[PDB]
Amino acid sequence: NEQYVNKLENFKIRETQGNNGWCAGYTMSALLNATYNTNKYHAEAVMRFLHPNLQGQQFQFTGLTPREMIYFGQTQGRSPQLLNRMTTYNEVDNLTKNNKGIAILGSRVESRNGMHAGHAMAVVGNAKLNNGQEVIIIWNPWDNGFMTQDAKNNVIPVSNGDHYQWYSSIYGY
Amino acid sequence: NEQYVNKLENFKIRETQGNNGWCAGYTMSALLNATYNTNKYHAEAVMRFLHPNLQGQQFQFTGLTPREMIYFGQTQGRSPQLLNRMTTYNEVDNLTKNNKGIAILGSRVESRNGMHAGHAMAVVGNAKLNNGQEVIIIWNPWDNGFMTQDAKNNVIPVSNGDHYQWYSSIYGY
Numbered sequence: 001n002e003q004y005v006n007k008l009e010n011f012k013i014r015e016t017q018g019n020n021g022w023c024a025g026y027t028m029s030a031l032l033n034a035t036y037n038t039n040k041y042h043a044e045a046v047m048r049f050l051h052p053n054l055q056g057q058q059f060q061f062t063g064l065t066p067r068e069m070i071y072f073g074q075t076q077g078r079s080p081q082l083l084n085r086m087t088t089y090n091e092v093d094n095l096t097k098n099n100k101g102i103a104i105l106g107s108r109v110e111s112r113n114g115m116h117a118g119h120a121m122a123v124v125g126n127a128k129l130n131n132g133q134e135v136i137i138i139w140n141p142w143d144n145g146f147m148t149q150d151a152k153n154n155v156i157p158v159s160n161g162d163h164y165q166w167y168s169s170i171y172g173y
Numbered sequence: 174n175e176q177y178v179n180k181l182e183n184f185k186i187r188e189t190q191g192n193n194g195w196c197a198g199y200t201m202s203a204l205l206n207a208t209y210n211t212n213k214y215h216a217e218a219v220m221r222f223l224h225p226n227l228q229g230q231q232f233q234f235t236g237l238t239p240r241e242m243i244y245f246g247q248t249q250g251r252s253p254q255l256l257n258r259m260t261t262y263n264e265v266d267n268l269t270k271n272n273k274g275i276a277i278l279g280s281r282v283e284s285r286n287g288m289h290a291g292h293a294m295a296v297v298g299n300a301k302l303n304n305g306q307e308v309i310i311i312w313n314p315w316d317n318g319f320m321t322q323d324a325k326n327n328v329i330p331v332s333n334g335d336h337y338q339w340y341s342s343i344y345g346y
């Protein structure tokens with residue numbers, strides 16, 4: 001389907017998200033594994049590093065803040081930067097060519113007692129389709145495969161039928 | 174090279190062993206991921222489950238006993254059995270067809286102040302080559318690939334030049 005494809009070279013899915021609140025741990029482990037060309041990071045280990053005192057269900061379901069995500073990247077030799085919007089196709093193209101990972105911070109369009117769950121995903125790269133559309137390739141931690149998102153649209157449809165608005169990005173993993 | 178190949182269906186290498194003493198954690202995570210068709214087990218998490226109080230270098234380098242390996246499999250819904258020898262080609266063929274994993278317990282032929290380090294590896298399956306040789310396919314946690322071992326020989330040459338005698342096996346993961 002693609003005429004041009006630009007991906008993070010060594011990105012590989014090695015684990016998927018089950019019943020826990022560790023989406024940002026999944027996302028940062030896969031981006032650091034790709035930019036360092038390693039297999040040592042795993043979500044559980046990220047989470048235990050940042051939340052050493054939580055146990056049981058609290059450990060299982062407590063997610064991360066953007067500050068915790070930025071400090072984690074600094075501890076692993078990166079300098080992540082918060083961008084308070086969705087990255088453009090050109091931005092993704094240039095960061096991907098430079099081997100810099102991008103985490104997506106998404107907010108669920110569908111509500112539940114007025115609250116919009118937050119969910120983090122990873123950018124894998126970008127591509128131009130045969131009809132000219134400019135797309136960003138995304139890995140959502142629940143899936144064993146990637147999605148393609150038109151770059152003009154800031155709401156990503158995910159595999160269970162929900163929709164997440166890409167409201168901010170952390171780049172530099 | 175093979176005329177017949179019998180492997181554990183969903184075995185996949187998802188991580189390799191760096192500077193730690195967690196070979197048995199690597200081996201059991203890959204065998205349980207394959208027999209359960211999952212990606213949730215990782216060596217670090219096995220080790221932390223069995224050694225919750227060790228920290229720092231003690232945590233990093235303390236390996237497992239066979240009893241700890243057997244109790245770990247019981248906690249994950251398996252009934253591993255210790256066999257005080259190398260499994261035969263036929264045994265590997267039948268266990269593999271039945272989706273039962275086998276851990277190799279190896280002892281280093283080369284010594285260091287009279288001590289023979291212990292190192293655990295995983296069986297992936299078995300195969301018959303085009304010249305008729307009967308072989309067992311092995312994954313050593315340090316490698317990103319498999320080895321083939323003639324079934325008549327109980328000493329496996331590994332990738333750094335050392336040799337490990339297969340002295341016992343734990344099957345049933």
Ligand SMILES: *[C@@H](C(=O)O)[C@H](O)C(=O)N[C@@H](CC(C)C)C(=O)NCCCCNC(N)=[NH2+]
Binds near residue numbers: 020021064
């Ligand atoms: C994501 C998930 O597992 O699906 C998980 O809930 C998560 O990390 N959510 C985040 C937001 C993403 C990073 C966009 C969020 O909800 N953050 C607030 C969680 C803060 C938990 N508290 C502390 N104190 N660390």
Ligand SMILES: *[C@@H](C(=O)O)[C@H](O)C(=O)N[C@@H](CC(C)C)C(=O)NCCCCNC(N)=[NH2+]
Binds near residue numbers: 193237277290
């Ligand atoms: C293997 C390695 O990382 O290369 C690692 O050293 C290991 O687990 N070795 C084992 C033997 C294999 C299971 C054959 C071994 O050396 N066992 C004795 C280690 C016991 C450590 N102590 C306790 N108390 N749990």
